[PDB]
């Protein structure tokens, strides 16, 4: 007779008639062989139900209340709709509920409390509204509660924090006001505490340190204020994510002794004061993110001692001082982000010792001196941004053999000398910005070999010679900017074949001839060519 409820369950469903392998009250009265519905060996009644990821796009019918021996329901990924019917509060045998990646709205029924055996509730990726029903600490068996990526409201129920059993608490993405209660450390079995993306206010409880059972603590992207307490230094956390809050004060030195940290993120906060050198002893941490803050001071060389660190982000701060060469000890370094600070001095020649080094970003600082050549030992270098600085000397030709370079940004500097021909051999290059510099020499032609290039900018330099004629080869180029140079000769007609080129600027030169109008080159007539005297067109 549970087959009847299975039919009504099938009735208000998606056009499943497709994949539901034969549920029917016509002939087959054996509903323990049907697709996705499992019966136990003993009494032949439904125990487990796996309809996961079938795109059955219906509503959850009320007849679910009639399936009594039902223990586990997986309706995940079926694009299902409606709310969760109240009558689910019937089957007390229910244990596992996965409504993941569906489209369900409305309040979570109060009847959910009537399921004593229920230890796993996952409602992530749904449209459910309402609050977190306070009647959920009534369920004694609950270990995992995942409500992440929904729209729930109201504070976090205070009584829930008193549960020895709970293991995974995921509230990430809702709009939950209220504050972190100290009762948070009365969760003695929880190893994942995830309140990120809420409208939460308040402070960090001072009792946060007495939570040695926590492995991942993610409070990021809320309105939490206050200092980072001393107690934070007792946490056995593997990942500690404090980024994107309004925390003030300095960085507690005692987090130095927190080597269980794998990922430490303090970014986008309002923290001030220097970088604590003691952080040199967390040699097992992989990600250090400190950017977006008001941090002052120098870069302590002790960060070279974090052997297992791969991502260092210190951008958007107020740091000063030279770049220390001890980062050359970071043989596992991948990303170095030092942007929008006030650093001065040279780029150390001992920094070319971190082979695995994808992105290097020092834009927006006050660095001086020439560019070291040993950058030719960084073969895996995919990103190089040195813009808005005072760099001198020629462009080292050795920058051409870093074959996988995808973006090369040298703008805003004092670079001199002609352009290296060896810059032609970056096939995977997309964006080459040499603008706002002091470049001598003429314009080299090997720029035809940038197949994937999208954006070329050499504006505001002293380039001379004729506009190269090979520039029509680049099909992926959408922007060609050559403003304010000494380029003469005529405008090559081949500049028409740039299919993707919708953004052009060649004004302010000694350019001669006509404006070739093969294709629709009338969109870039007036403005793009303004500053050239010997150009045929109606302007001064």
């Amino acid at each position: 007779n549970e087959g009847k409820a299975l039919m009504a369950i099938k009735a208000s469903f998606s056009n499943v008639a497709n994949m539901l392998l034969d549920w029917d009250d016509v002939h087959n009265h054996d509903f323990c062989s049907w697709r996705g519905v499992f019966c136990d060996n003993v009494s032949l009644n439904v125990v487990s139900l796996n309809l996961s990821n079938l795109n059955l796009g219906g509503e959850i019918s009320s007849a679910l209340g009639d399936l009594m021996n039902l223990q586990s329901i997986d309706l995940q990924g079926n694009k299902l709709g409606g709310q969760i019917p109240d009558e689910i509060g019937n089957c007390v045998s229910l244990a596992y509920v996965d409504f993941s990646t569906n489209l369900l709205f409305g309040d979570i029924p109060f009847s959910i409390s009537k399921l004593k055996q229920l230890e796993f509730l996952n409602l992530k990726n749904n449209q459910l509204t309402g609050p977190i029903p306070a009647t959920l600490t009534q369920i004694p068996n609950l270990k995992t509660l995942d409500l992440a990526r929904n729209q729930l409201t109201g504070e976090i129920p205070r009584l829930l924090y008193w549960n020895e059993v709970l293991q995974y608490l995921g509230l990430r993405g809702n709009m939950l006001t209220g504050t972190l209660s100290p009762d948070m450390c009365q969760l003695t079995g929880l190893w994942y505490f995830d309140v990120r993306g809420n409208n939460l206010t308040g402070t960090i409880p001072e009792s946060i340190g007495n939570c040695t059972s926590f492995e991942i603590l993610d409070v990021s992207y809320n309105q939490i204020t206050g200092v980072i307490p001393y107690n934070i230094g007792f946490l056995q956390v593997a990942t500690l994510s404090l980024q994107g809050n309004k925390l003030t004060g300095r960085i507690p030195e005692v987090i130095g002794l927190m080597q269980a940290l794998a990922v430490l993120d303090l970014s986008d906060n309002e923290l001030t004061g220097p970088i604590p050198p003691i952080l040199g002893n967390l040699s097992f941490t992989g990600k250090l993110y400190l950017h977006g803050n008001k941090l002052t001071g120098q870069i302590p060389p002790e960060l070279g001692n974090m052997s297992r660190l791969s991502y260092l982000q210190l951008n958007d701060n107020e740091l000063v001082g030279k770049i220390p060469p001890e980062l050359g000890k970071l043989e596992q370094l991948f990303e170095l982000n030092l942007a929008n600070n006030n650093l001065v001095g040279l780029i150390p020649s001992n920094i070319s010792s971190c082979a695995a080094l994808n992105q290097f970003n020092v834009h927006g600082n006050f660095l001086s001196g020439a560019v070291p050549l040993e950058f030719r030992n960084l073969g895996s270098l995919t990103y190089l941004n040195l813009s808005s600085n005072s760099f001198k000397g020629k462009i080292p030709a050795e920058l051409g053999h870093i074959i996988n370079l995808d973006t090369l940004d040298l703008s805003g500097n004092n670079f001199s000398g002609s352009i290296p021909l060896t810059l032609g051999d970056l096939e995977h290059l997309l964006i080459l910005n040499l603008s706002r510099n002091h470049l001598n020499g003429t314009l080299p032609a090997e720029f035809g070999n940038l197949r994937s290039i999208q954006i070329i900018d050499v504006s505001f330099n002293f380039l001379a010679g004729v506009i190269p004629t090979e520039l029509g080869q680049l099909q992926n180029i959408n922007s060609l900017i050559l403003n304010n140079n000494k380029i003469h000769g005529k405008i090559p007609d081949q500049l028409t074949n740039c299919f993707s080129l919708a953004n052009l600027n060649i004004s302010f030169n000694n350019l001669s001839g006509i404006i070739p109008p093969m294709k629709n080159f009338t969109r870039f007539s007036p403005a793009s060519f303004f500053g050239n005297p010997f150009l045929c067109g109606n302007w001064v």
């Binding site: 992530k124 994942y192 991942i216 990942t239 927190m258 080597q259 940290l261 794998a262 097992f284």
Partner: protein, 34 residues
Amino acid sequence: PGSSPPTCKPVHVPIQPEYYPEAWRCKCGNKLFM
């Protein structure tokens, strides 16, 4: 006052539910984890 990693060969793993939050889990050469 402090913390220290575990000793089962230890390693730190992403768990996929932006980046992934990493937790401590020990695997030897064998692809297991505990």
